[PDB]
Structure formats: C-alpha cells, structure tokens
C-alpha cells in the first residue's frame, strides 16, 4: 500500500502545480480579459455601492422605521452629506426625504452595475457583438464612439500599452468632465473656485478634465518610452501599477486625515459629534429572568431603562464616543493598510516577473535604467547595505528613547521622569506638521522611518535576490522558484529564502509601523510603553512636558483602557475572541513542524480505518491531508495578518478617547 500512499503525498507536493488561488493569473489571460474582468467587478462594485446606500435609510419613504446604524455606511455618510444626497436633520421629514434620494441612487447604481457586468461578460468571452446592428467589433482597431474617436485619436486605437496611455488619459478627462456635470446638473453645485465649499469640487473637476485631456493628447502623439520592457509582459506592468497605486492610497489616507478635521470639513465630519447613533451589536435594553411580555405588556416581569421596548438597541452619544474621529480613523487607516499591502504586492508580483526573466535569460537583454542599474551584485549589497545600516541606526536610536522614557517614568534604577527625553520634540522647522508637538511626535516620525526601512529590507531582497543572492552564488545554488519553502536541513538550513517568503516577512514586519499608525491616530502615547498607569511617574507626563491634550494610554496600558469599551459590547467582544482565535492558529502552520503533522495524519487515517473496520463492516479511507510549508506560510500569514487587524478594528471602532485636559501631577 506504500505506492498508493505515496501517490497522495505526491498529489500535495512542494513542486510547481496548479492551485485554486492562481487561476486568474496574468499569464493565462489576454489583454481583452483584463479589461473584461475590471468591467465585471466595477459592475459588482456598483451593486455593492447600492447596498451601502439602502442600509443608510433611517426612516422609509412610507414613513415606517428602517435600518439601524452600521459601519459600512458610516464611513460614507459624511460624503453623501457633502454631496446633498444625505442630510443631518432632526426633522423626520428631512429623514424621510433623504431616504428617497439614497433609494434612488441605489436603484441607479443597480442599473449601471448591470450594464457593466453585461459589458464585462461579452468582453471576457470575446462575444462583443452589437445586438442592434448585427456587425461585431475589433479589439485592436475600433473607432472609439464613432466621430469622437476620429477627431482626437485620428480614428485609431492604441496597439501597445505605451500607446494606450494617451487614450486612457482622454477617457479619464471624460470622467472628470462627467462628474463636473453630474454635480452641476443633478446635485446643483455650480463651479465656484473657492476652496472652502463643495462647489470647489466642481470647479476642479473641470480644471482636471482640461489637464488630463491635454495630457492625453500629448501621450497619443508622443507615447512615453520609459520602462519599455513592461509593454512586453502584463505582470511587469501590473506590478509597477500596484507599486504606484499603493503609494497613491497611502497619500489618500494621509490627506483624508489632515482634511477631514479641517474647519471647512466641519459640516460633514465634526458635525457628527452632535448625533445619537444606534450601532448594531451595541448593548441593548436588558430584561429580567422571569420576563414575559404578553398582549397587555409589562406583566409579571421587569426590564432595564423602561424608556425603550424589550431588546431594543440603546442610544449612544456621538460626543462621548467621539464618532467624528472614529469615522476619520476608519477611512484613513483603511486606505493606508491597503496602500501598504498594495506596495508589498507590487514588489512581489514584480519580482515574480524578475524570476521569469532570469530563468529565460531576458534579464541581461533589458535596456531600461530601471533594470540595468540593478543587475550588478556589488551595487545590490551597497543599496541593501545602506538600507540595513539606516534601519539599524534608527530602530536602536528610537527604541532606546522609548525604553529610557519607560524606565524614567517607572522610577527603575532610581531615575525620575526629569532624566527622561521630555525635552525632545520635533524641531521648529517641522512644528507645523503637528498639533501640540511633543516627544510623542518625535518618536512617531522616527518609528515610521524605522518601520519603513525594516520592511524595506524584505522588499529590496525581492527586487535583487529573486533568482540568486551573494550567499547562494557563493553556495552554488539557484532559486528556481518563487514559492519554494527551503532547500532542506543543509548548510544549517535555508528556510524562508524564496521571494514569496520574503513577501511574508514584509507583511509580518510591516505590522509594527502598521500599528504605530493605529496607536498614533487614536491619541495613544508612543514615547513610553507605560503612560497614565497608577504608578510612580506615568501620570506626570502631561505636566512635565506641558501637553495641551491628554493621550488615552501608553503602548502597554493601551490594551487595558481601550478594551473597557470593547468588553461592554457583546459584538465588539465577539470580534476580540474570533480575532484572537484566528491569530494563534497561524503558529500551527508557521512553526517548523510540517513533518510532525504528516506522521500524525498517518496515525489519524490509520486509526479511522481501524475503528471503522472493528465497529462497522465498511472501510473508511479518507487519507487525512496536510498542507505544504509554502502552502503553510501562505495560510499562516493570512491567519496572522488577518487576525492581527481583525482586532485593530476594535481599537479604532471602540471610540476616540483622547481629551483636551492635561492631567496635573499625581503629587
């Protein structure tokens, strides 16, 4: 039975094979299918966007009660208020009129989404036939909306990616102009060019439509020759776009933090502090053990509050819970974690293409300064050498400051908070970047600098060591593959050497700076691991450094304070248990025990065969499966990263509890 048993392990091996999570890969799809897939998802995205609109209705058009508050719509409510579809009004009439508008935009997105899905099926199946005029169209050569195509594109379509830039830019100016008309005609916002009103978003919707159209014609006549090697392969271009989109998303996250709490954005974001929100899963009106409410009601029982019915979600004061910043932290963090994730994948899917060329030898044939200036091994170890040195001199300079501040605050080794770095704060030149600048701001800048250079090491290694490294050229070895776990025990072992594993060590290392953001935007103290504890000098910070605000907690005391509100909620606490349960299970597949599970699975499948035969008359052969290391490090990073930030949501959605009253010394 050895052979049959081996045909199975062979059915689950570390060698190249087809996997369910690689079927929509760029390699097996032509350029007509990428366009078709993007269209079908935007149709689904419109269907999704139309559900975030129906959910926002508080009172239905017929006047009856609607939906309870939910986080999906909350992150978009300040935008629909800004555009006039949604309105913050106590009057039930405004609440009933508003609901009709959201329902109308939801049905509209249902119609347009259905068109994009239809226009995404025919493109995918190359069945792009006009149902009215029997004649079909050509992807390579088409008129592009008839007469409009002839005047601007000389009646021709782009045959190469570098050419598609001009037409794509022209298509963008038709959206910039298209939105500038929707705002003017449907939403009633005329283009007044003053940057304190929503009317400025129509004026710049036309300025941008002019810049892009002019820029889209210059690239039609003069397509850029930069990164020509990308025009040859889809994944090469798709990865540079993803490395670019991630920095774009991080930028969007950073401006939505500065802007959403500007005075001009007060009518939409700060305005929320004066609203009562019934969030789902929040503590409801409790009832007694012997509580039976019959037709007569309130008989032979008792209930909590008595100002609301049994099992009804209780109100929540926006000012107390800090709703404004909670929403501002949920949007800013979303576009930052995603931005970081996009950058990591751009480098991964990019080095995934650098491996394909090194194997085929096209690497030495590239002429772009974007690859040529990076094929020298001496130059690589210099770039990586400086990145590692900078990462070290900055992770040790800022960690020792945080540790020293912690030691001074806890009076360890007879040291008072006076000897700590309370005098160190950002220089005067940078003081404009921060409100009430302090050591909490000097540390955060250096932590992000150290947290970027740390995860950059794993990225420079994907870019430079996809096929070979100075060590494996020394050890005479080839990295044939992007997802190979290790070469075995040899040379003290060589686990985690592929670029997919280096991607994992960028996501795992990126959890620190991805947490220095969560902690810093929630008004937490980052200069000390212990701030505000009932101990020696933790509460002396607000007056030793003269801070205008009072931070919620320090790195360690953050978990205790922020979770007082999590434990009070029956749903925020379910996330705390699920999120922790998912995270530890990563250790089972990330620890070097893949072999043990396999011999264990053998005993599992042997015992089941034994029990089934001794009890029943049938033969139970299930051949218990076990994941491979590369398949383990995959699921391991998804359980680790995916459970780590299932709970970061709880820190941001539990409320914003930074104040404006610095504490006096606990003298």
Ligand X SMILES: CCCCCCCCCCCCCCCC(=O)OC[C@@H](CO[C@H]1O[C@@H](CO)[C@H](O)[C@@H](O)[C@@H]1O)OC(=O)CCCCCCCCCCCCCCC
Regarding 505 and contact with ligand CLA (CB under 6 A), the answer is yes
- Residue span 498-517 as binding mask against ligand X, x where in contact by CB under 6 A, dash where not: ------------x--xx--x
Q: Which DSSP string do the residues of 163-179 spell out, in sequence order?
A: HHHHHHHHHHHHHHHHH
Give the CA angle between residues 637, 642, 646 to the nearest 5°: 155
* 493, 625, 664, 666: which one binds ligand SF4 (CB under 6 A): 493
Q: Find the distance separating the first CA and the last CA of the chain, reported in whole Å.
A: 78
Joined together, the tokens standing for residue 263 give 């005075």
Determine the 3-state secondary structure of 553 from DSSP: coil
If one counts every other C-beta atom within 10 angstroms of the C-beta of residue 595, the result is 10
CB of residue 350 to ligand X, shortest distance in Å? 17
241 is in an annotated binding site: yes
Q: Which DSSP string do the residues of 275-313 spell out, in sequence order?
A: -B--BTTS-B--B-TT----SS-S-S--BSSSSS-TT-B
Stretch that binds ligand BCL, among 234-242, 391-399, 406-414, 614-622 (CB under 6 A): 234-242
Residues 520-539 that bind Ca ion (CB under 5 A): 522
Answer for the pair 353, 482: CB distance below 8 angstroms, yes or no: no
Regarding 445 and contact with ligand X (CB under 6 A), the answer is yes
What burial class does residue 399 get, using C-beta atoms within 10 Å of its C-beta: 0-12 exposed, 13-18 middle, 19+ buried?
A: middle
130 is in an annotated binding site: yes
Regarding 142 and contact with ligand BCL (CB under 6 A), the answer is yes
522 is in an annotated binding site: yes
- Per DSSP, 59 falls in state B
293 is in an annotated binding site: no
* 9, 14, 41, 47: which one binds ligand BCL (CB under 6 A): 41
Residue 6 — φ and ψ, nearest 5°? -75, -30
Regarding 485 and contact with ligand SF4 (CB under 6 A), the answer is yes
Can you tell me the distance from the alpha carbon of 530 to that of 558, in angstroms, rounded to the nearest whole number? 9
Q: Which residue has the tokens 């009562």?
A: 276
CB of residue 118 to ligand BCL, shortest distance in Å? 6
- Longest Cα–Cα distance of the chain, Å, equals 89
Can you tell me the distance from the alpha carbon of 555 to that of 524, in angstroms, rounded to the nearest whole number? 7
24 is in an annotated binding site: yes
Answer for the pair 34, 234: CB distance below 8 angstroms, yes or no: yes
Residue closer to a second copy by CB (options 139, 584) is 584
CB of residue 496 to ligand SF4, shortest distance in Å? 6
- Per DSSP, 425 falls in state -
Q: Which residue has the tokens 């200036």?
A: 373
Residues 333-392 that bind ligand X (CB under 6 A): 336, 340
Can you tell me the distance from the alpha carbon of 324 to that of 648, in angstroms, rounded to the nearest whole number? 18
Regarding 283 and contact with ligand CLA (CB under 6 A), the answer is no
Which among 580, 586, 588, 601 is positioned nearest to 647, based on CA atoms?
Answer: 580
Residues 535-594 that bind Ca ion (CB under 5 A): 562
Can you tell me the distance from the alpha carbon of 285 to that of 414, in angstroms, rounded to the nearest whole number? 51
Answer for the pair 224, 120: CB distance below 8 angstroms, yes or no: no
Regarding 414 and contact with ligand SF4 (CB under 6 A), the answer is no
CB of residue 152 to a second copy, shortest distance in Å? 51
Regarding 24 and contact with ligand BCL (CB under 6 A), the answer is yes
Residue 129 contacts which entry, ligand CLA, ligand BCL, ligand X, none (Cβ below 5-8 A, type-dependent): ligand BCL
Can you tell me the distance from the alpha carbon of 351 to that of 343, in angstroms, rounded to the nearest whole number? 12
What burial class does residue 37 get, using C-beta atoms within 10 Å of its C-beta: 0-12 exposed, 13-18 middle, 19+ buried?
A: middle
**Cβ within 8 Å of residue 359, ≥6 positions away:** 467, 480
CB of residue 188 to Ca ion, shortest distance in Å? 38
Regarding 288 and contact with ligand BCL (CB under 6 A), the answer is no
Residue closer to ligand X by CB (options 352, 455) is 455
Can you tell me the distance from the alpha carbon of 339 to that of 14, in angstroms, rounded to the nearest whole number? 31
Joined together, the tokens standing for residue 214 give 């002019």
201 is in an annotated binding site: yes
Residue closer to ligand CLA by CB (options 321, 509) is 509
Stretch that binds ligand X, among 160-168, 395-403, 518-526, 577-585 (CB under 6 A): 518-526
Residue 629 contacts which entry, Ca ion, ligand X, ligand SF4, none (Cβ below 5-8 A, type-dependent): ligand SF4
Residues 499-538 that bind ligand BCL (CB under 6 A): 500
Regarding 592 and contact with ligand SF4 (CB under 6 A), the answer is yes
Regarding 492 and contact with ligand SF4 (CB under 6 A), the answer is no
Residue closer to a second copy by CB (options 72, 491) is 491
569 is in an annotated binding site: no
Determine the 3-state secondary structure of 68 from DSSP: coil
* 175, 403, 433, 535: which one binds ligand X (CB under 6 A): 433
Can you tell me the distance from the alpha carbon of 667 to that of 664, in angstroms, rounded to the nearest whole number? 8
Can you tell me the distance from the alpha carbon of 447 to that of 441, in angstroms, rounded to the nearest whole number? 10
How many residues touch ligand CLA (CB under 6 A)?
24
Regarding 292 and contact with ligand CLA (CB under 6 A), the answer is no
Residue closer to a second copy by CB (options 445, 598) is 598
Regarding 629 and contact with ligand SF4 (CB under 6 A), the answer is yes
CB of residue 528 to a second copy, shortest distance in Å? 11
Can you tell me the distance from the alpha carbon of 11 to that of 373, in angstroms, rounded to the nearest whole number? 42
How many residues touch ligand X (CB under 6 A)?
29
CB of residue 26 to a second copy, shortest distance in Å? 26
- Per DSSP, 129 falls in state B
- C-alpha Rg value of the chain to the nearest Å: 30
Regarding 118 and contact with ligand BCL (CB under 6 A), the answer is yes
549 is in an annotated binding site: no
CB of residue 471 to ligand SF4, shortest distance in Å? 16
CB of residue 448 to ligand X, shortest distance in Å? 5
* 74, 83, 106, 234: which one binds ligand BCL (CB under 6 A): 234
**Cβ within 8 Å of residue 72, ≥6 positions away:** 51, 52, 55
Q: Cα separations (Å) of 31 from 232, 291, 352?
A: 12, 65, 19
Regarding 497 and contact with ligand SF4 (CB under 6 A), the answer is no
* 453, 518, 530, 653: which one binds ligand X (CB under 6 A): 453
Determine the 3-state secondary structure of 65 from DSSP: strand
Answer for the pair 176, 209: CB distance below 8 angstroms, yes or no: yes
Regarding 344 and contact with ligand CLA (CB under 6 A), the answer is no
562 is in an annotated binding site: yes
Pick out the residues of the known binding site for bacteriochlorophyll a: 22-24, 38, 52-53, 70-72, 79, 109, 122-123, 129-130, 135, 142-144, 157-158, 168, 201, 229, 241, 243, 247, 269, 334-335, 338, 342, 345, 348-349, 352, 369-370, 394, 427, 442, 446, 571
Q: Which residues are annotated as a binding site for Ca(2+)?
A: 522, 558, 562, 651, 654-655
Which residues make up the interface to ligand SF4 (CB under 6 A)? 485-486, 488-489, 493, 495, 592, 594, 629
Kindly list the residues in this chain that would bind ligand X in the complex (CB under 6 A).
250, 254, 257-258, 332, 336, 340, 433-436, 441, 444-445, 448-449, 451-453, 455-456, 510, 513-514, 517, 520-521, 523, 549
Cite the annotated binding site for chlorophyll a by residue number. 399, 512, 596, 604
């Amino acid at each position: 039975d050895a052979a049959k048993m081996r045909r199975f392990l062979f059915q689950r091996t570390e060698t190249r094979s087809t996997k369910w999570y690689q079927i929509f890969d760029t390699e097996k799809l032509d350029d007509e299918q990428v366009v078709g897939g993007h269209l079908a998802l935007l149709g689904v995205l419109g269907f999704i966007m139309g559900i975030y609109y129906i959910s926002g209705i508080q009172v239905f058009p017929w006047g009856a009660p609607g939906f309870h508050d939910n986080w999906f719509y909350l992150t978009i409510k300040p935008r629909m208020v800004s555009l006039g579809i949604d309105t913050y009004s106590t009057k039930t009439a405004d609440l009933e009129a508003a609901g009709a508008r959201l329902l109308g935009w939801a049905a509209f997105h249902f119609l347009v989404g259905s068109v994009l899905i239809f226009g995404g099926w025919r493109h995918w199946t190359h069945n792009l036939t006009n149902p009215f005029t029997g004649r079909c169209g050509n992807f390579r050569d088409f008129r592009f909306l008839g007469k409009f195509g002839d005047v601007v594109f000389n009646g021709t379509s782009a045959k190469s990616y570098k050419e598609a830039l001009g037409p794509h830019a022209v298509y963008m100016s038709l959206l910039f102009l298209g939105w500038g008309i929707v705002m003017w005609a449907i939403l009633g916002f005329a283009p007044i060019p003053d940057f304190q009103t929503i009317n400025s978003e129509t004026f710049m919707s036309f300025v941008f439509a002019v810049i892009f159209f002019a820029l889209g014609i210059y690239w039609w006549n003069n397509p850029p020759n930069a990164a020509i090697h990308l025009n040859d392969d889809m994944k090469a271009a798709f990865s540079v776009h993803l490395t670019a989109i991630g920095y774009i998303n991080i930028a969007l996250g950073c401006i939505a933090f500065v802007a959403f709490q500007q005075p001009s954005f007060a009518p939409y974001y700060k305005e929320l502090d004066k609203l009562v929100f019934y969030l789902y899963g929040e503590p409801f009106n409790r009832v007694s053990f012997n509580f039976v409410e019959q037709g007569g009601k309130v008989i032979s029982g008792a209930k909590e509050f008595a100002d609301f019915p049994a099992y009804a979600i209780l109100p929540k004061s926006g000012e107390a819970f800090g709703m404004a910043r909670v929403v501002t932290n949920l949007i800013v963090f979303n576009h930052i974690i995603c931005g970081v994730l996009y950058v990591f994948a751009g480098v991964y899917h990019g080095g995934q293409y650098l491996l394909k060329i090194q194997l085929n030898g096209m690497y030495n044939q590239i002429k772009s300064i974007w690859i040529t200036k990076g094929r020298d091994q001496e130059v690589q170890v210099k770039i990586l050498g400086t990145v590692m040195a900078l990462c070290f001199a900055t992770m040790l300079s800022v960690y020792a400051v945080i540790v020293w501040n912690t030691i001074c605050e806890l009076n360890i080794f007879g040291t008072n908070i006076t000897m700590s770095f309370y005098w160190l704060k950002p220089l005067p030149i940078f003081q404009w970047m921060f409100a009430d600048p302090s050591i909490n701001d000097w540390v955060m800048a250096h932590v992000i600098t150290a947290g970027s250079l740390f995860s950059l090491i794993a990225l420079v290694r994907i870019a430079f060591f996809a096929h070979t490294s100075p060590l494996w050229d020394d050890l005479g070895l080839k990295k044939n593959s992007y997802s190979f776990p290790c070469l075995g025990p040899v040379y003290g072992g060589t686990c985690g050497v592929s670029i997919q594993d280096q991607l994992w060590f960028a996501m795992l290392w990126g959890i620190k700076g991805l947490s220095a953001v969560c902690w810093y935007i929630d008004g937490a103290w980052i200069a000390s691991m212990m701030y505000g504890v009932p101990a020696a000098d933790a509460k002396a910070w607000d007056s030793i450094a003269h801070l205008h605000h009072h931070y919620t907690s320090g790195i360690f005391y953050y978990f205790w304070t922020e979770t007082v509100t999590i434990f009070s909620s029956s749903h925020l606490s379910t996330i705390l248990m699920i999120g922790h349960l998912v995270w530890f299970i990563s250790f089972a597949v990330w620890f070097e025990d893949r072999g043990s599970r396999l011999e264990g699975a053998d005993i599992q499948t042997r015992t089941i065969r034994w029990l089934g035969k001794k009890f029943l008359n049938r033969d139970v052969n299930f051949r218990f499966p076990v994941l491979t290391i590369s398949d383990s490090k995959l699921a391991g990073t998804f359980l680790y990263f995916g459970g780590t930030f299932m709970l970061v949501f709880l820190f941001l959605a539990n409320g914003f509890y930074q104040t404006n009253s610095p504490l006096p010394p606990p003298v």
